[PDB]
Structure formats: structure tokens, C-alpha cells
RNA sequence: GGAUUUUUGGAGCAGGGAGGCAUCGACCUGGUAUUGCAGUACCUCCAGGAACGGUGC
């Protein structure tokens, strides 16, 4: 199982936790959560730090959330990048 | 690993939860179970496009949760230990 | 096996009302109720979302696509739990 | 007992339907298993069963041969019920075979006779003669020729019988001594005696 | 859960006696007593079906091991 | 478990599917997921022949025959 | 019984009068209902006494004993002993719960019943 | 009785061109030749097409693996 | 053609929609006894016709004699006993 | 043989030939329509044929009742608050009853959904202008006595009685 | 640990919120793994949950009776009133 | 081909340029790095095509399995 | 005592916008065909009418 977290597509999350790097999460709510992965699981539940939530309403909006838990079903996409840099 | 276990440790914390249907829930956790079914007390719940209502107790089916906003104080590194 | 499920099986042979996930409302005799809530019924009255009614002899609805069921009050009198 | 008919008119062969899994079922169920636990005694027979065979298509029914001159059908699902008994042989029944479609049924006994049966009534449809005791008998597998019987005889020969005529179609004399068993290596085309 | 088994019935007990003994718990829909036609007497047991399962339950609790016609009876869900 | 559908085998049926979609045809078989084989199927009308309906998307069925 | 059903649909004091006037086991349940209604005091216990006059009954009386524990004491214990069930240890459990907080010479008497043959 | 999975196995063997009804999307359907499939009804389609019922327009796809999540219905087409 | 539970009607105005035809047929024929079912199609073959099935046979005979040539939606209906027994009757009998 | 709750509870209940839920109250010799509350508003149709009812009245509020078959009774009068207890009454079959005066049919004007009306074999039928009178006073009817109410009849009924 | 969080509210009158946004108020008598619920003397509300709305408290109320709700379509529950004694 | 199944097809397509359509109509073109048992998908040098038009160049991307409509090699 | 009849779950996420367009269906006037023994998407055709009904943007 660890092997599948380590080398499979979830290695994106595994890599973000290890390097304390930022990732953008496109989300079902049409919102995007930008931050660092403290923890994750099979379902893509996550505990996130320094989250910048961004969305639109046209008007763009954002808000800072230091500490939060995301239920993984809401995940559409998870992006790793030269974002942290 | 199983992050629901982490949430199960948060009894007596106060949190804000955003629901899948947009509803916002602020209250004190009395219990999270294995299905992430969450139970609270002293709850101020604001359905999208209403003024808040206060409930002494509220019980949420786990699947209907989008995300929890945790106390800034929360010592995550402690809670992530098993 | 769940407590509500046992009570559902108890309503077999009684007149029950069923609303689907799409809000169509089916009233008639419950012939068979499966464990997963799959429902065989007969001599139905169906009331659509526009309000109109129709009549059907025989129906079978998948459990997942049921929102809820109304059972007789004859059952109410499983008080142990 | 009082079997007669079941349900609303369903035969004691036509549909397996109730049992977990599916009789129509693809040929390989899965990676196979070996059993420890025994479920049904069955009995009925006061003498050792001569033979046991399942049912054409999928194991819906099971059929047994008694040396008490008797043949019995069974659920084959561990179910208590034995369907309809058959009686009509003088001496112990040696072997049997089923109609590929599954409606007819054939038995051979040491009484020098061979009988064609209606699996749905127990009716002795036809009896085939000849002096020699008949050992293993098969029914042609091919859809085209369900009609032909192939009977192996103690007296060297194998004989094809036209079911409709009841007459001998084709004798096979090449073999020496007794014939024990006949299979079909490829349906219709060949068989190994 | 509406049908009860009732055993340990004395010879004098019949469907009328059973109706009278169990009706205090609730309405009854059926009472069956298997008979031996060679003797014309019952075999010592019967099945009593209540209209409501809750009533059948109360009957089991109060009638099991109770006395009827001088002897102890046995009462429980039939199946 | 199997769905209890043997009663409906080889009968003409009216199938309400998600998306407000409706088809009619003869039941030729099923599996534990309630996936169906429907023969002589008609989209409600245009004839589509023998088809597979995934049980997932089956809302309701109604017999057009007496069972 | 249908009149009792329509009266049940009508159903609280006057309904209790209609029920008591209507009043085998159903009358006892109606008596327990009269006790639950009257207690909503001692008069309800009197209704429990009339319910005892109606006679099951033992169970109901035992329940009533739970509602008023220090109310009658030895008299309540006598009501228990007067009942007469052939086994009926559960009553011994009731006396046991009564003694956890009661004691006295009476506790010893309760223990003595305990000596009585059963299991 | 024909089992649904087997029908598919037939579609596969036949190389009949197949038209798929998708879940909760009526304006588009998918077409192709089933080359293989799995226990989840996930399909490998060849020379596949998006079919716009509204626009009468076809989008050319080639090698497609369609998740079974989307499958409402499976039909065969002569084309 | 012997008396039958089912009556065959022809010479009916085929412009009436099928569900309306069946409902008026039911209404009209209810006066003689319970009508179990009505079979009426608009195919070329079957248009302008209907089979009305009654629980009681006496009801069918009374209907036949009393409504022969009754003006229905403009035309005089022609009634006769059906050639065969209705499937529903055969199932209800055996 | 009063129409009672007990009577209704043992009465044949079924899905009729036109696919509606119908209650069978035929041939009981009922004289007065009463106690319909016990049907619990669960029927689309109620068959009261071959009884002895005198007045079409006495109904509770029944929202699902759409068809009333009242053949071979003794109906001589129609109650005045019928729409208040039967709002969706769409079909009324009164064949072979006792309505004698055109004015006795007046209460049917208040049944807003009434579309199928049959009054055959009633003395009232032979009264001069019976058809035009019904058409003008109960315009919501589309089929009268199994014949289509046509435009020309409506106009003709507009002249007379205007 | 305790499993009680549902069992506590059993027998109580409960306000249950559905996924479409309906309000089911009934006596909470049973539940299960899926949160399929058994609700006695159950009514449905659509427009409001009253907190003493001076105009009226009740619009689009429907009496249902004995209801079994499937857990799939349940969102949440709060205590509405104490158990009826009966 | 002689039966070509979902799983092998996807495995053959690892190391290759793919495009994934999601149920929601977004499209993502990139090199398929890997897939897992649940058919979650990992792209590199991802690009986003919405309305079939290049929207955003995104880099390395995880797509949750339940979102996927279909995958195409391209 | 996490592998298909409970309790280690296959769930999940997604709806407002505006104050005409597209499709489906009865439908209403005239006139016209059809007279046949049935178990049903729907049911003649021809011309005219829709300040009709539903669904989506």
C-alpha cells in the first residue's frame, strides 16, 4: 500500500507532504484551495496548512485559512508545480 | 493514514464546517465516528442564504461534509501521531 | 441486517406509498421488498411532479432510486431497540 | 408423496434460477477450490449408487442410478427434495446419459435392455432390444443428431440406434472382447472407445 | 412475529379456552390446534396468532411458564 | 443477492431511466447489479434492437404484461 | 373493543373516566395508563392499587414500586411476597435493589426468602 | 436467459459498432468498437466518436477507454 | 356464435382517441354489469372496433340486446358475441 | 343495508379497465350515500350502480375521486355543495335514474372539472330543449350522453337562454 | 467507543433535513448502518422551520404518518422536542 | 485485436501523451506518468483545454478517478 | 471476527439565469375515410386555428 502511495498517482500527495510544498486543489465547490499538505489518505481527505481559498462570484475572491480538513470526495484535481518556489 | 481517526480526536473543539450543499456549521464537536458522521453542541448553523439558527445539538451524516476549518491553535503534529 | 429493513419486510402485503429520487409518488400493495430496498408493487396509483395521476397494474422500483416509503400505522406497535 | 407439479407449471428441470450464482454461467468460474465439509447424505438407495450424473447445460438437477433397479433425480443444490423416481428395470442399472437439450434420458441395465425416458414425466418412451448386455451408452452430442444412440456392448460391437425407427443404423465390429466406455473427443466428428 | 407456539396443553384445553386466556393481551386473528383424528384429541400444543406483534410479545412475557388448567405451559415465537 | 426478477423474464416491460429517458422491451436476463438484457427494445419511437441497460441508471420498471 | 378504539381516538381525566368505566389485560394496561396519568401522586398509586384489584399485573405493580421506592417499604415488600409466583426470582432482584439502599431487619428477611428453593 | 455481461462479450467478439448512452448527459453519446472490457464495465473502444444529438456533429476520438461510471445503456449500430 | 362474456363492437367512429373511446365504452356498458376489461386498438386492422368483457354472461347478453344500434359518437354501433373466449376470461376460469 | 364503514372495508377493491383505482359498491341496496370517510380518499372511481340512492349528496371531501358510476339507482335530486366535496369530479354517469326537471340538473354547473356526463334514461331527457339546456348551464361538459358537445350547439344554446 | 450518539436521541422528536432541502419532523424510533431512519407520527415541511414567525409558523405542512427514510438522502438531524409518553 | 482490456490498454499508454475528458467537460492533455487500481491518474506537463481551446498550462497533476469520463491517447 | 445478506462504507460533486429561440405532445373548427371480434407508445386523411401544455438555454 505504501508503495502505491509512493509511486502511484497519489505520490503527488506523498511528495507534497515530504517536501512541505504547495499544491493547488481544484475543488467540486468551484473553489480552489492553495496550500500545504500536512496529511492525506486514500480518499484524498487532507489536513491543510496556510490555505489560500480562491473562487469567483464576475468578481474574483479569496480568503486565508490557516488550519483545515478536506473531505476527499470534493477533489477534482490536485496540482503540483513550481508553486512553492 | 486513516484521517477519520484524527477527526475522532477532536471532541470538545470548536470548528466551522462547510457542507456539500453550501451550508455553514459552527459548533463544538461532541463526536466523530468512523463514517465521519459528526455530532456537535452549541451550534450556529447558517444554511446558504439564511440568517443563522442556533441549535443545542446537531448531527451530520459524514458524506455531506465538504471540509472542516480547524482552530488556529490546533497542534496538528501531536494529533497526527498514533 | 438493519432494524428498519426488518420493519419494511413486515409491511409486505400492506398498502404503502413510495417516493422516488425523481419525486414520482407510487401508492399500492407491497408484494416483495428486498434487503437492498428493491420494491415490487401492484395496483398502483402514480402521482407525477406536475400533479397528474395514472394507474398501473405491476411495478418494480430499485432500492437506490427510492427517496422514502410510507408504511401503515398498523406496524408502529421493534420497540426493544 | 405429492410432487405432481410445482409452482404454476414449472418443470423439475427447466430453470435453476434460485441458487446463488448462475447456471448459464461462463465456463471458468474463477480460480478453483477443494472442499472440506460434506453437506448431503441423500440416501433413498439401499444399495450403492451405480452412477451419478448432473444435468445438460448447467448442474440444475442431479441424477442417480441404483442397483435396486431404480433411478432418482435430485436438487443438486443440497436441497432435501428428490424429484421423480423412475422404475422399470429388472436388474441393476449399469449406466445412463442425457439428451443434450435435456428432455430425454437414457438408461442401460444388465437385463439386456435399454430405455429412453421422458425426464418430465418418468415415461418409458422406448425400449431397445438385443441379446448382449449393454455397457456404457451415450447420446450423440451434436445438435443435428440428438437421435442416435451409441451403445457399447460386451459382445465387441458398438451399435448406433436410430431413436425414431428404433432400428439398428451402424455396427462397429473392429473391437475385441468387451467395450467399457465411450466418449466423444470432438463433438459429432469423433469418439474414443 | 405475530404467531406464538403454545405447548403443555391439558386435554380439556381447546380453541375457546385459548381465546379466553390470550385475548387479555390483544385481539387474536387465528388459533390452530393440530388434531389426531384417531383419538379426536389435540397433541398438546397450538399456535396463536395475534393481530399485533407487540401484543404477541406481551403475551409471551406473561404467559410463558404460567398455569393453565392446572399445569405449566410454554409460550414463545413460533418462528 | 439476486434481484427477484425471474417473474419478469420474457415479459414486455416499460423502463424509466435517469435523464427523463424511457424505453420499452422484453426482459432477456439480469445479474446481481440489476444490469438488464432487453430485447426488441424501443426508445420512446425508434427500434434499437437487443440492448444492455446498466442497473445503476434504472429508476423504475413497469410490466406491460400480467405476471 | 371498537368503542374502546374510538374512545382511544378521543383520548385526559374525562377519557380516564371513560376508560375506567369501560373496564382483561387491556383493562390492566388502562389502569397503568391511569397511574401514569395521575402521577403526571399518591392517588396514582391508589390507581395502581385498583390495578392490583384488576388482577402482567405483577410486572405493572413491580414497575410502580420502582416509581415510589421509599414510599411504603415493608408494606410494598409484603405486596411482593403476597403475589405468589412459583419461581419469580426477579422479585428477589427487586428486593436486592431495595436492600442496596434499605437494609434493616427487613433486609435479613429478604435474604431469608432468597433461601427459598428455586435455582 | 442471457446475462448482460455475456451480451457484451458478444459485442466484443462480433466487433459490432456500439453506441453508449451516458449518465445524466443526453446531448452527447459515445460510439466505438469494443476491443475489451473489465469487471467494472470499463470499456476499451476503437475508432470512437462523440455524438452530439443536438448539433448533429461528430467528434473523432480514436483509442478510448470509457469509465463504466457513465454507462446508462449499450446498443449496437449497423454503421 | 354462442353467447359469450365478451362482445365485439364494430362500426364505431374511429376519430375518437383510444383512451377516451375506452373510457366512454366503460361508462356506457357499466349499466349492465361489471366490465372486466376492454380491448381496442387503432391499427388499420382493428380501428373502429372493440371487445368489451364482462364478469357475468347475463350482463353480456343484456348489453347486446339493449344497445344494438345505439348512437355512439354519431354512429349506430353494431354488437355481436365474440368468436373466441377472451384471454382474461380463460385465466379467470382456470 | 346502510352504506357503512364496515361495508366499505370488505368491498371489492381493484384497478379497473381504464387503469383507475375503483371501489365496488354495486348491488347492496344502499338508500343513502354516507360514511365515505372510511375510503380515505384512496379511489379514482366509485361504482354505485344498481342501488336505491335517491340523492347524489352526502360526500366527504374526496380529492382523488374522479369518476362516479351511478347507474340504475333512483336519483331524483342533486346536492348543492358537490364541488366543495368533489373538486376534480370529471365523469358522472347517471343512466337510468329519476331526474325529471331541467332545473334539477342545475347543481352540476358548479362542478368545474365535469367533462363527461351521461343522463340517459331519465325522464328529463324528453323535455323540450334538454340538450341545449344542459350545454348552456353546464358548459364545462365536453361529451354529453356519449355525443360530442359541438360549437353549433353551444351557439344555439347561447341564442335560446341568452 | 460508546455508539450512543444516535441511541441517545431514540424515542425523541427529531427534525431531519433531506438532501433536496425538505424538513421531516417525526418520532425517531430506529436507525441503522446506512442511517435509514424510522419516523413515527411524521410530518413534512417545505417553506420554513418556525422560530415563531409572527405571520404564521406553518405553510406547506403535510401529514405523512409512519415514515422510513433512506440514509442516502439524509443530511442532518437536531432535537425538536421530547418523547411523547404513549 | 485479440481481447485488449482496460487495464493493459492504460498500462501501454503510460509513458505516452494522453488527453482525459472529465465528466464536467474539462479536458487535460499531458504525459501519463502512472495510473492506479482505482484508475486515479497522474499527468506531467499537463495542459488544460476547456471548450476545446487551450486555457492553462499546468504541469504535474493528479486526477481523482471518479471525475474521469474517458481517456484518449493522442 | 476489513472480500458480495449489517459494523471498517463506492461514494462523490454539480443548478442559477432572463422577463425571445429550439424540440415533444395532446388540441380546437370544418370537412372527409373506415363497419373490421379486441388486451394498447401513439393512431384516417385534407384545410384552417393555437391570447395551449411541458423540458432546456
Automatic annotation (TrEMBL), chain K:
<protein>
    <recommendedName>
        <fullName>Small nuclear ribonucleoprotein-associated protein</fullName>
    </recommendedName>
</protein>
<comment type="similarity">
    <text>Belongs to the snRNP SmB/SmN family.</text>
</comment>
<feature type="domain" description="Sm">
    <location>
        <begin position="1"/>
        <end position="83"/>
    </location>
</feature>
